[PDB]
Design a protein around this ligand. Structure first.
Ligand SMILES: NC(=O)c1ccc[n+]([C@@H]2O[C@H](COP(=O)([O-])OP(=O)(O)OC[C@H]3O[C@@H](n4cnc5c(N)ncnc54)[C@H](OP(=O)(O)O)[C@@H]3O)[C@@H](O)[C@H]2O)c1
Ligand SMILES: NC(=O)c1ccc[n+]([C@@H]2O[C@H](COP(=O)([O-])OP(=O)(O)OC[C@H]3O[C@@H](n4cnc5c(N)ncnc54)[C@H](OP(=O)(O)O)[C@@H]3O)[C@@H](O)[C@H]2O)c1
Ligand SMILES: C1CCc2nnc([C@]34C[C@H]5C[C@H](C[C@H](C5)C3)C4)n2CC1
Ligand SMILES: C1CCc2nnc([C@]34C[C@H]5C[C@H](C[C@H](C5)C3)C4)n2CC1
Lengths: 239, 240
């Protein structure tokens, strides 16, 4: 089965970490495909500009809700609102991560914990909230992970710990979904370096892997989830 | 080259989740090799019985401290008290896990969180507490993981997630330590099914893998840590 931009046409999609970076690109991509979108992040400010340009790009719905994925109660409640706003859910793109930077690990448990809460725990919380709505549509769950979630790299240990956990968790749930009756697919994205603002600043003179375009990456994620692909790897050509 | 039971002789070792199972087996092995051991777990009474049989087995020191790795403060203070008792640390064997059982995941976020806290966070917290003592001894860290910490399996999703995190974190810290000046080794153990009491009860009649012996396991872990092996795989002869 080939991808067709129409596969997204009209679908009800949720995109977290959408105020910037790859998250925003997907929201615009989803708008250009005429989908319903609910974007979330902390920047109330930036989200509104993203919603508006989403309408201009052709989104069917284009709403936003702001709040921190540090608060599990928000993540839970947000999926309810987003489902109410759209009257259902087809696809849940889990993409937000707490800010991290390249640093040797010394004793920053605080970062290790916050990283695990925002990068891993909240995804499960959002997944638990979205599962019923997703079951009613035979929908899709999209987990945006990193190449550091498959291979441990120095200077990103805590972040790496969180992106592994997603692998362990969502890769098992996928197996349970199989012998259960759950028709919700789970696409895990293993991205290399992507030329987003925050990323490129963070790696500035440390190590160059030839980042790949955030526009093309954002689509390649959307493409995989549409095709119910088990996982997606963006520019392995660069590995 | 080969392991020699003396390599642990006199060494000051910590074993968590040592109140039973593979954790207890490691403490007894360590005493038989005549090392100093400080075991921790929640079971005050059971721990006392383990220290006693360790003295009998020939351990040099053989003490205990009781408490739950749910309280991050305890873990932090535990390594402090444990280092005073032995006057240093040579090897830190992280072995405890929160109770888990075969269950499809539905909405037990509570278990996901407790699993990450006990099976993963406390290990970092303990690792942080011991690094000075371990640097001062060019020591070793042993993280006891599962075949589920490398392959996703149904019914163990929360547990599996926690064991993946251990790999990602310690596998980087190992590489970080490589380019820093840190001579502390990190041994990751990927065990298959091991015939401990709780595991066999928890898997009974559901899963049919060839259980492997806890005595040989507990040793095969220690051998790995003694030789500063990056990781150890126990009875891979049972899976393929
Ligand atoms: N960029 C890469 O090279 C790369 C490589 C591999 C994997 N990835 C993965 O790709 C995803 C995004 O990459 P990126 O370049 O887009 O990062 P990014 O540009 O910094 O985007 C971060 C997003 O996450 C949100 N966010 C941060 N903290 C949040 C919090 N407490 N609560 C809610 N939202 C929060 C941000 O919104 P607010 O600031 O408004 O809170 C922001 O929209 C991530 O899942 C990453 O793991 C990226
Ligand atoms: N058993 C297997 O087949 C298998 C396979 C792969 C990997 N592993 C790993 O091998 C390690 C031990 O395996 P096992 O079968 O021997 O487990 P076990 O027999 O049940 O031993 C559990 C130990 O962990 C401690 N424990 C439980 N909750 C604790 C808590 N909140 N705080 C502190 N300690 C706690 C117990 O002491 P208290 O009850 O007194 O608290 C107990 O001494 C584990 O790290 C496991 O992940 C095991
Ligand atoms: C900001 C944090 C977001 C992020 N997610 N993955 C990465 C990578 C870190 C390094 C270098 C490169 C490939 C791989 C190992 C994954 C990019 N980053 C870095 C940018
Ligand atoms: C009780 C908790 C201890 C534990 N850790 N990993 C396992 C395994 C679960 C299943 C069957 C077998 C191989 C692999 C998949 C890992 C053992 N267990 C047994 C269950």
């Amino acid at each position: 089965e080939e991808f067709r931009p129409e596969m997204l046409q009209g679908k009800k999609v949720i995109v977290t970490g959408a105020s910037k970076g790859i998250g925003r690109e997907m929201a615009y991509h989803l708008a250009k495909m005429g989908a319903h979108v609910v974007v979330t992040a902390r920047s109330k400010e930036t989200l509104q500009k993203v919603v508006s340009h989403c309408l201009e790009l052709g989104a069917a719905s284009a709403h936003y809700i702001a709040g921190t994925m540090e608060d599990m109660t928000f993540a839970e409640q947000f999926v309810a609102q987003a489902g109410k706003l759209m009257g259902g859910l087809d696809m849940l793109i889990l993409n937000h991560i707490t800010n991290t930077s390249l640093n040797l690990f010394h004793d920053d448990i605080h970062h290790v914990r916050k990283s695990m809460e925002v990068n891993f725990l909240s995804y499960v919380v959002l997944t638990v909230a979205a599962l019923p709505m997703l079951k009613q549509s035979n929908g899709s769950i999209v987990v945006v992970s990193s190449l550091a979630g498959k291979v441990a790299y120095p200077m990103v240990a805590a972040y790496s710990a969180s992106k592994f956990a997603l692998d362990g968790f969502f890769s098992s749930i996928r197996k349970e979904y199989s012998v259960s009756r759950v028709n919700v697919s789970i696409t895990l994205c293993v991205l290399g370096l992507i030329d987003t603002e925050t990323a490129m600043k963070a790696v500035s003179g440390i190590v160059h892997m030839q980042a790949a375009p955030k526009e093309e990456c954002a689509l390649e994620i959307i493409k995989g989830g549409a095709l119910r692909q088990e996982e997606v790897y963006y520019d392995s050509s660069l590995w």
